[PDB]
Symmetry: C3
Amino acid sequence: QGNECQIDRLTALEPTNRIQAERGLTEVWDSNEQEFRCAGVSVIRRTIEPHGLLLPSFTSAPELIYIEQGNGITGMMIPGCPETYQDQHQKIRHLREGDIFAMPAGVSHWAYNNGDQPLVAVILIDTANHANQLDKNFPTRFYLAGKPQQEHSNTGNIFRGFETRLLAESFGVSEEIAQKLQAEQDDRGNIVRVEGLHTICSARLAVNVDDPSKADVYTPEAGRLTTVNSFNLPILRHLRLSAAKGVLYRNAMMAPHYNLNAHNIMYCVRGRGRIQIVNDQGQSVFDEELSRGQLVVVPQNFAIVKQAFEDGFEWVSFKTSENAMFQSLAGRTSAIRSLPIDVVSNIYQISREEAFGLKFNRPETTLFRSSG
Amino acid sequence: QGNECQIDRLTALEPTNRIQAERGLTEVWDSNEQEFRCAGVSVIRRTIEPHGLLLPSFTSAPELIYIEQGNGITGMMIPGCPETYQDQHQKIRHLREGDIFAMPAGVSHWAYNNGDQPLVAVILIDTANHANQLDKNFPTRFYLAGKPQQEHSNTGNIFRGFETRLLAESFGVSEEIAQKLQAEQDDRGNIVRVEGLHTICSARLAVNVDDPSKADVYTPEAGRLTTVNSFNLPILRHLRLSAAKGVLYRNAMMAPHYNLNAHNIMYCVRGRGRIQIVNDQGQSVFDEELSRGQLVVVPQNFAIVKQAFEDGFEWVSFKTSENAMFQSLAGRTSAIRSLPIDVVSNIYQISREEAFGLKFNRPETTLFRSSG
Amino acid sequence: QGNECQIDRLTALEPTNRIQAERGLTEVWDSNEQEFRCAGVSVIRRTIEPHGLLLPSFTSAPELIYIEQGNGITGMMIPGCPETYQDQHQKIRHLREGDIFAMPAGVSHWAYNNGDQPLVAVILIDTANHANQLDKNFPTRFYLAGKPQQEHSNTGNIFRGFETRLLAESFGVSEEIAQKLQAEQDDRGNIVRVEGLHTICSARLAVNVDDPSKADVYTPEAGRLTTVNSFNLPILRHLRLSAAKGVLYRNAMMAPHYNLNAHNIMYCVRGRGRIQIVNDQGQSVFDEELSRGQLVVVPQNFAIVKQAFEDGFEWVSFKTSENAMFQSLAGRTSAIRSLPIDVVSNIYQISREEAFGLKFNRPETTLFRSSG
């Protein structure tokens, strides 16, 4: 078939499946939605209650994680990295709100909310990544403990699969304890309640996009845009993903722009925006308001404008390539302004002075203060 | 299915659709042709009349452009590149005959023929490029002005898609002028008549293959071969495409060879040649004469020989990978000559002296002077 | 469809087609097998009798070759590499048992057994490699001599395809000899009997994994693991494949582990092992004994344990990515040991001391001495 990107209708998408576990919630968007198929990604949102432990798992696809809310810690068990010092374990890293974290394909990991508010992560799973060599339709997830529900469609964690004897032998451990590995008798789900706890090897593997000094774009009382790519997060050189966080203040807008190289899974973090998206046909495929917890998939090259309402509008964009670049159509550093004025007047059939105003009437860069 | 490269018949291909615009012509080859599906490319040829302005557009796929005829200028609006100095615009670059230009995915651009003869560009659109994340069947093109016809299959340029108000607001411009953006009232097509006009940021993004000093191969009264790859055109490191131009003089031939790594879209620029192509089965899939404006798709690894006729034969080869490499079967630096003579005689069941002549009777490299 | 990696059953796979030639045998596994489709590879094994010459050929896919048995020499005709000094030919390289050799896509090559025992190579053909731009279902092979049978499904070597005249002309050779090229009158098949014979340009393009000093893992009376990746075989940076050889001594085991980034085509070289493989569902998809000449496909991220029997168990793993990395679940440098003990006890619902033993009772790295 291969026509999933012939899109004339996009939708504000919300999770269509829930997975309730003892200490957390996993909400799964519908990966069958055409625009997800086009983008080749899946999105989940996990809400881990305080003292909740997301059991160790891995997925064949790389993930881009935004910590929407809360703080906690994630342990990554990267093969080959140094033990640490009783007890030994690999580097524990901290998760905080505003954090954009990169999970390389196959890397096993667990998370724990050691904070007071629920820990909330919005996870892009890039099933179409070159790194994912399993199926492209749905993420494949392998758990290392518990008896977790399938997240994307007689089952258990990978240990349940092995002959119990082999397990016991493997760990130099009793059979009875091996059965604990297999968690055949476990009903807690993928996020369990705990009490308390207590170069890739050394990098943070994250950058906090709430750090206003890191913004690439600010416009006085318009807002800011903060990019995560291969320069501030070098691992993204390997994942070939990037990300951005945007804040639009009351009635501010992001000029119509298109992303050159990447699909943009724009998740609304807070506020509300009139979002309009146009396809290659010059047809609007989207003209709706996005608010908390909704996302829209902006396909590569699809033109888009974001107009904040009175409460502003804030989003994280997961981008399906390395150093995704976009181009504003209006403003300073825009397609129009890059056009020689004669080209502008000629292509739009307007005066050299109408052209001028078309080019320069908008002095802001990318983010504008607007009236609502 | 995935059998589009099971090819037993190739065809001399010509455009199957025309798109007439006010100041230019766009001829589109049939991307459904099996060998195009196999190669994962589309080909167009644009003829821009003098004083003709190819409206700004972009496509999700990278393009390799050969300027077959004429000269003019192209403006590339690469996001982030410096303005220039009344008026400000991005770097204007010159296009001349023999130019092989690389357009990265998503980069918006316009062209203008400021010369006296029609400006003619043969464009390979590499829809199967990793850079293209939309559909693979047909190029997706987005225009920034006018009301252009679909080039590959109630429509308009991307601005037509937006709420007019939002447009006006975006540019700090009147509504009436915003409607000009949307060009709902435009009948000029994608190439309009104009009057006159007047690290990637600084590179030429082109090399002229008509520069005889750049030839990698010359053979006295046989002709020349000139390659564009990542060394003389570094951007091609990003596009993962390469190109070559070949000139065969009267009755000269390019020895049977195969390309190791890439499909070869060989477009005939001038002259005429008996071209023969063999598949993995040892079957001829092509044995016809190519002339002006026709192309054949040579699939990766398919063996091919090109025999010029009395007027010679000249072609541009667009190659679907980085630094595509080929191997001659005959001549100096050929498969046969690289074979130890005993291997040759043994595999061909011939004498050590028949073998010798098989190896050395052909002292030329790649291009030979032949009799017609 | 795209569900070939939804695997609940793997099989010990053996060749399903034989191709007998005059001086050798070619055994072809069934590339239609679901797990081959999932992995996107094909496997062949060629047995070249002493004094046997594997005719020159190339395939659009890169190959990883393990010399299971024997020694001989392979000639690679890489385009552009220096002639050598009567006779001139390209660098001849030696093949020996334990050799893991990398063949880049499209590179023409022949092999010859100049040894006394049959020369046996197990060949992974990575049809799903980015380098292969032809069909993905089956390897495409082009021969440069003889009249070889199709290896994967009115035919001949590529020369047979050309007009004989053109051939003769091409090589400056008589017609009668040109017909020898076309081998229309040849019944020897792809491996013929001979008598005797006699930066990529200069690299060995191989590393011998039988070199015990190169082992990355040894465990006293357990065995060893030896990896071939981009560091000891730099060309693999281009192929994006890796390999390993494993030897398990009597009753030794490789702890349950999963490969993070790559499918693992594990071919059994000698001995016998109880191999168990688990999918993402916690279901065993394989629990059988592998022995000489059988392979199983371990999909990326599928968990696996290998238990040698009394004769030990030795395998070569062809891996479908660059520097494939795996993670042991048990032992030193394992997922479990990388887990903070509180996470372990909490996720497995066991004591801080049961947890401890789960973590540390297994002091070996990856390879363990076990009881059978």
